Design a protein around this motif. Structure first.
Motif, PDB file in Angstrom:
ATOM      1  N   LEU A   1       5.177  -2.832  -9.578  1.00  0.00           N
ATOM      2  CA  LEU A   1       4.958  -1.536  -8.764  1.00  0.00           C
ATOM      3  C   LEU A   1       6.447  -0.891  -8.518  1.00  0.00           C
ATOM      4  N   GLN A   2       7.236  -1.915  -7.831  1.00  0.00           N
ATOM      5  CA  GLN A   2       8.469  -1.500  -7.357  1.00  0.00           C
ATOM      6  C   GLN A   2       9.177  -0.924  -8.722  1.00  0.00           C
TER       7      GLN A   2
ATOM      8  N   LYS B   1       0.776  -1.035   0.084  1.00  0.00           N
ATOM      9  CA  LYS B   1       0.027   0.192  -0.131  1.00  0.00           C
ATOM     10  C   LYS B   1       0.786   1.236  -0.181  1.00  0.00           C
ATOM     11  N   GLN B   2       2.045   1.305   0.838  1.00  0.00           N
ATOM     12  CA  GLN B   2       2.780   2.406   0.906  1.00  0.00           C
ATOM     13  C   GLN B   2       3.402   2.574  -0.382  1.00  0.00           C
ATOM     14  N   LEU B   3       3.863   1.655  -0.986  1.00  0.00           N
ATOM     15  CA  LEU B   3       4.493   1.524  -2.350  1.00  0.00           C
ATOM     16  C   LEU B   3       3.467   2.111  -3.467  1.00  0.00           C
ATOM     17  N   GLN B   4       2.238   1.727  -3.162  1.00  0.00           N
ATOM     18  CA  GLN B   4       1.352   2.218  -4.273  1.00  0.00           C
ATOM     19  C   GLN B   4       1.348   3.847  -4.075  1.00  0.00           C
ATOM     20  N   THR B   5       1.700   4.358  -2.946  1.00  0.00           N
ATOM     21  CA  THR B   5       1.855   5.640  -2.531  1.00  0.00           C
ATOM     22  C   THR B   5       3.338   6.053  -2.698  1.00  0.00           C
ATOM     23  N   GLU B   6       3.956   5.078  -3.264  1.00  0.00           N
ATOM     24  CA  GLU B   6       5.413   5.543  -3.420  1.00  0.00           C
ATOM     25  C   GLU B   6       5.174   6.153  -4.811  1.00  0.00           C
ATOM     26  N   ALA B   7       4.465   5.198  -5.570  1.00  0.00           N
ATOM     27  CA  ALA B   7       4.297   5.618  -7.086  1.00  0.00           C
ATOM     28  C   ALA B   7       3.329   6.716  -7.194  1.00  0.00           C
ATOM     29  N   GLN B   8       2.486   6.919  -6.016  1.00  0.00           N
ATOM     30  CA  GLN B   8       1.408   7.992  -5.873  1.00  0.00           C
ATOM     31  C   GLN B   8       1.609   8.596  -4.412  1.00  0.00           C
ATOM     32  N   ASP B   9       2.746   9.894  -4.567  1.00  0.00           N
ATOM     33  CA  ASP B   9       3.058  10.434  -5.934  1.00  0.00           C
ATOM     34  C   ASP B   9       4.057  11.121  -6.066  1.00  0.00           C
ATOM     35  N   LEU B  10       5.159  10.344  -6.761  1.00  0.00           N
ATOM     36  CA  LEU B  10       6.192  11.019  -7.208  1.00  0.00           C
ATOM     37  C   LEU B  10       6.072  11.537  -8.682  1.00  0.00           C
ATOM     38  N   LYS B  11       4.911  11.332  -9.091  1.00  0.00           N
ATOM     39  CA  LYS B  11       4.745  12.067 -10.530  1.00  0.00           C
ATOM     40  C   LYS B  11       4.379  13.543 -10.049  1.00  0.00           C
ATOM     41  N   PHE B  12       3.773  13.719  -8.907  1.00  0.00           N
ATOM     42  CA  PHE B  12       3.529  14.870  -8.126  1.00  0.00           C
ATOM     43  C   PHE B  12       5.057  15.523  -7.614  1.00  0.00           C
TER      44      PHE B  12
END
Lengths: 51, 429, 40
Positions: free
Chosen positions: C3-4, A1-12
């Motif tokens: 994901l990673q 979950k935290q990794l999904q939030t790693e991706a979300q959001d490094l775009k940001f």
């Protein structure tokens, strides 16, 4: 979950870094404009001191 | 290999367009050698300054030499030592300079992306450049030299100035769809401007010089890519070295990816794999007291597994004569050179070295990929299996950290520090 | 894994935009020093 939030959001984060970058580029644009402005009046004639 | 002496002071070197001259830079002078006569001196240029850059004009008549923190550009006509010109317009800095092909002129780059004032050597004609983005990067001439695409930045937005080079004037000023221009290439037939964006977006923007985008090599939005790019010497073909150990081979006729060539790690998984390695050896016969403790380039198929920042990047996409092979390597393979075979579009002739690869050059006129790695040896991907050109005691400790290779692919220039080896490799061809 | 990988792809791009920012902040300091040198 935290990794999904790693991706979300490094775009940001990429976007915020882009804003900081743009801020710096703009400062540099203005600063370069000051540099062109000063050069155009200082060296236009002061270049003769040099040459 | 035929050798000259060990050139002392040869901090760096360049060679001429016609491959007849080698310029050796010593901190205070440039030595010019006419290799065809012998690997001997002709002219010498000296100065009371520190040299950091030199370029031969593409007629090999003059050398442009640019001095360090002195902001000085010095131009010497080799065929006329009385023609000494300097650009000392120093109030703005003279950070670099490049030659403008048949315009007989110097593009001199001021500091701070201010100007890249053109200094005609026949009449100055100093047209201002509207905030050039770079010195060499982003300054790219069309294949016939008609246009030059300059990465430029204004209103903090990258754009490409399109300069018509004969009148050295801006014509098709164009806002480029980039985040950050890295460099610019022109198509071989000058049908498009291939624009290399920042590695962040993985994209190639293909623009018609007359209308803006033709196509785009799709970004992945969030990954680094487009690490390097090259156009082959075919009617046209380009391949893009990404940053995911993969090359996107694009047929420029349609600008479509024909394939994706991935370096992987598993040699056995390439259907046409051929693997070689540098390996320990003894000298060739009939050698004598020259000693042994040497290496040879040999085939070794047994090898399967091959050895952020500068990792996974495609290090090159360099094309062979008529582009049947792509030498590439990866930042992830410090010890090996990947050679892709096209038309197979499969990996073949995978070379491992005992020396982390510093670089390589396809020879013009066939292949015999020159591989160097700071070992006082030239390794080659000889088409005929394998070859190593041992360098002699005559330069026993020379490393060869950089290699230049003449377009007239007869003369090799090996560079280390204040030291150069000039010669004629096994070039009977 | 899926994901990673993306996440790292994102970290990689951030490091490169950071380097651009540094080139600019350093250019910024250098510009200021040039202007000051010119005025003085």
């Amino acid at each position: 979950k935290q990794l999904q939030t790693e991706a979300q959001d490094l775009k940001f984060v990429l976007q915020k870094s882009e804003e900081r970058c743009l801020k710096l580029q703009d400062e540099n644009s203005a600063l370069k404009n000051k540099l062109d402005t000063i050069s155009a009046k200082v060296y236009l004639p002061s270049c003769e001191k040099g040459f | 290999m035929q050798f000259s002496n060990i050139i002392q002071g040869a901090c760096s070197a360049i060679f001429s367009q016609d491959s007849s001259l080698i310029a050796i830079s010593n901190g205070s002078k440039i030595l010019i050698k006419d290799i065809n006569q012998e690997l001997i001196n002709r002219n010498v240029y000296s100065f009371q300054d520190i040299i950091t850059h030199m370029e031969f004009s593409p007629d090999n008549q003059l050398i442009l030499v640019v001095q360090s923190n002195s902001n000085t550009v010095e131009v010497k006509n080799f065929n006329d030592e009385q023609w000494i010109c300097k650009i000392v317009d120093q109030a703005c800095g003279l950070l670099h300079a490049v030659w403008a092909p048949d315009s007989r002129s110097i593009i001199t780059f001021s500091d701070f992306q201010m100007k890249a004032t053109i200094y005609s050597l026949t009449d100055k004609q100093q047209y201002l450049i509207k905030n050039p983005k770079y010195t060499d990067k982003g300054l790219s001439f069309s294949s016939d030299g008609k246009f030059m695409a300059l990465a430029e930045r204004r209103d903090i937005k990258d754009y490409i100035g399109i300069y018509y080079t004969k009148d050295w004037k801006l014509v098709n000023h164009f806002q480029v769809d980039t985040m950050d221009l890295v460099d610019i290439q022109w198509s071989k037939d000058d049908g498009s401007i291939l624009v290399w964006d920042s590695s962040i977006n993985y994209k190639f923007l293909v623009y018609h010089p007359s209308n803006g985008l033709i196509q785009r090599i799709q970004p992945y939005e969030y990954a680094l890519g487009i690490k390097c790019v090259e156009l082959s010497n075919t009617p046209n073909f380009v391949a893009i070295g990404s940053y995911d150990e993969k090359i996107r081979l694009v047929n420029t006729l349609t600008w479509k990816i024909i394939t994706e060539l991935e370096h992987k790690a598993n040699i056995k998984e390439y259907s046409n794999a051929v693997v070689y390695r540098e390996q320990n050896s003894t000298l060739l016969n009939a050698q004598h007291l020259v000693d042994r403790t040497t290496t040879q380039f040999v085939i070794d198929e047994s090898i399967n597994k091959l050895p952020k920042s500068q990792q996974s990047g495609v290090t090159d996409v360099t094309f062979s004569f008529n582009a049947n092979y792509i030498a590439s390597k990866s930042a992830s393979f410090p010890n090996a050179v990947f050679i892709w075979e096209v038309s197979l579009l499969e990996l073949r002739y995978i070379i491992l070295l005992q020396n982390p690869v510093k670089g390589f050059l396809w020879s013009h006129n066939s292949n015999n990929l020159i591989i160097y790695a700071g070992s006082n040896k030239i390794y080659f991907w000889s088409l005929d299996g394998a070859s190593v050109c041992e360098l002699p005691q005559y330069g026993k400790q020379f490393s060869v950290n950089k290699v230049l290779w003449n377009k007239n692919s007869k003369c090799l220039v090996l560079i280390d520090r204040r030291d150069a080896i000039i010669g004629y490799p096994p070039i009977d061809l």
